[PDB]
């Protein structure tokens, strides 16, 4: 309905991300700090040694199969328009290694999609049943980079004592987490869908410290204007939270609704 905030990102993204609410009286969320890149709250010592970067020697646009950075990702998974290859493994995505400051290529090469930031028009809006959510203000073709899951990098030991685990993304590999509860970007508002339309992909850009992949959401199908974005939060989230609330995604594939939980519980016998 009417726009309550012109840009929740305070100008830190390539495009503004407005907030609207046509459902209830809740004002624009303001109990967190918007950040556009991951932050640290303890000593993490991400390995930023430029000599530890694997890098390419391309003098073209890194569209050839001899791009070392593409080879690290098995092959460069970006097409000429920056979208994931149509054979990209969406079920089990590979690690993507983008070009970096040690590569001989130019900053506009074809292997720098995620580091170039948000390009699609997104909107923070009030959903009917799931609080705030994020939807597209444009058609988004399948394979398009949407946004990064940005927040506070924390150790697994720190995550184990975090009281609010509603905004946690496990990185896995000596395992770390992104906590977007107190510091986060637009992705902290993306809800869970049992029939998701975006997938998280682990990406390396300016560093290649394998403890800290950056989490990039790409569309898993064509997305229509106005459609809510959502990914599969996974079973660790729902094993913990189903006791407190159930899924409202409304899909016929929904496996975390009260009915879905009760039906598997009845089948139990
Ligand atoms: C994706 O979603 C989640 C991920 C969660 N991940 C963790 N850890 C500890 C990571 C650390 C590395 C591997 C496992 N903990 C959670 N919760 C713990 C439960 C016990 N309390 C006292 C502390 C918080 C999580 C909850 C999630 O969603 C509800
Ligand atoms: C990362 S947040 C998403 C943004 C949240 N809706 C908000 O208003 O800030 C996760 C929380 O959103 C709600 N949520 C997300 N997906 C949901 C779903 N499929 N069904 C019910 N609640 C959901 C739950 O409260 C969940 O703990
Ligand atoms: Zn290259
Ligand atoms: Zn390169
Ligand atoms: Zn390059
Ligand atoms: Zn569901």
Curated annotation (Swiss-Prot):
Compartments where found: Nucleus; Chromosome
Ranges for domain Pre-SET: 54-117
Binding site for S-adenosyl-L-methionine: 130-132, 167, 191-192, 248
Region (Interaction with histone H3): 156-173, 233-236
The SET domain, residue ranges: 120-234
Residues reported in the UniProt entry to bind Zn(2+) 2: 56, 69, 99, 103
Domain Post-SET per the UniProt entry, residue ranges: 243-259
Annotated binding of Zn(2+) 4, by residue: 194, 247, 249, 254
Highest taxon in the source lineage: Eukaryota
Binding site for Zn(2+) 3: 62, 99, 105, 109
Residues that coordinate or bind Zn(2+) 1: 56, 58, 62, 67
Coiled-coil ranges (or none): none
Tissue: Expressed in all tissues examined, with high levels in fetal liver, thymus, lymph node, spleen and peripheral blood leukocytes and lower level in bone marrow.
Residues flagged as site, Histone H3K9me binding: 149
Oligomeric and partner information: Heterodimer; heterodimerizes with EHMT1/GLP. Interacts with GFI1B and WIZ. Part of the E2F6.com-1 complex in G0 phase composed of E2F6, MGA, MAX, TFDP1, CBX3, BAT8, EHMT1, RING1, RNF2, MBLR, L3MBTL2 and YAF2. Part of a complex composed of TRIM28, HDAC1, HDAC2 and EHMT2. Interacts with UHRF1. Interacts with CDYL. Interacts with REST only in the presence of CDYL. Part of a complex containing at least CDYL, REST, WIZ, SETB1, EHMT1 and EHMT2. Interacts with PRDM9 and CDYL; interaction only takes place when PRDM9 is bound to hotspot DNA. Interacts with SMYD5.
UniProt similarity note: Belongs to the class V-like SAM-binding methyltransferase superfamily. Histone-lysine methyltransferase family. Suvar3-9 subfamily.
Function summary: Histone methyltransferase that specifically mono- and dimethylates 'Lys-9' of histone H3 (H3K9me1 and H3K9me2, respectively) in euchromatin. H3K9me represents a specific tag for epigenetic transcriptional repression by recruiting HP1 proteins to methylated histones. Also mediates monomethylation of 'Lys-56' of histone H3 (H3K56me1) in G1 phase, leading to promote interaction between histone H3 and PCNA and regulating DNA replication. Also weakly methylates 'Lys-27' of histone H3 (H3K27me).
Domain notes: The SET domain mediates interaction with WIZ.
Protein name, per record: Histone-lysine N-methyltransferase EHMT2
Native source organism of the sequence: Homo sapiens
Lineage: Eukaryota, Metazoa, Chordata, Craniata, Vertebrata
């Amino acid at each position: 309905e009417k726009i309550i905030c012109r840009d929740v990102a305070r100008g830190y993204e390539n495009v503004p991300i407005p907030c609207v609410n046509g459902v209830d009286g809740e004002p624009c969320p303001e109990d967190y700090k918007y950040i556009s890149e991951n932050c640290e709250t303890s000593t993490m010592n991400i390995d930023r040694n430029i000599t530890h970067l694997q890098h390419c020697t391309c003098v073209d646009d890194c569209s050839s199969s001899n791009c070392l950075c593409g080879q690290l990702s098995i092959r460069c998974w970006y097409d000429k328009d920056g979208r994931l290859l149509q054979e990209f493994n969406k079920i089990e995505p590979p690690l993507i290694f983008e070009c970096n400051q040690a590569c001989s290529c130019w900053r506009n090469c074809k292997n720098r999609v995620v580091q170039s930031g948000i390009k699609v028009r997104l909107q923070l809006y009030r959903t009917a049943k799931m609080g705030w959510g994020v939807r597209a203000l444009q058609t988004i073709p399948q394979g398009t980079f949407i946004c990064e899951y940005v927040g506070e990098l924390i150790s697994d030991a720190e995550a184990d004592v975090r009281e609010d685990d509603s905004y946690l993304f496990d990185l896995d590999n000596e395992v770390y987490c992104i906590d977007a509860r107190y510091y986060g970007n637009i992705s902290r508002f993306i809800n869970h869908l049992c029939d998701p339309n975006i997938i998280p992909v682990r990406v390396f850009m300016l560093h290649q410290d394998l403890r800290f992949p950056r989490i990039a959401f790409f569309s898993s199908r064509d997305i229509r204007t106005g459609e809510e974005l959502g990914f599969d939060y996974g079973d660790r989230f729902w094993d913990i939270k189903s006791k407190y609330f159930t899924c409202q995604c409304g899909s016929e594939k929904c496996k975390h609704s009260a009915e879905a939980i009760a039906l598997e519980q009845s089948r139990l016998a």
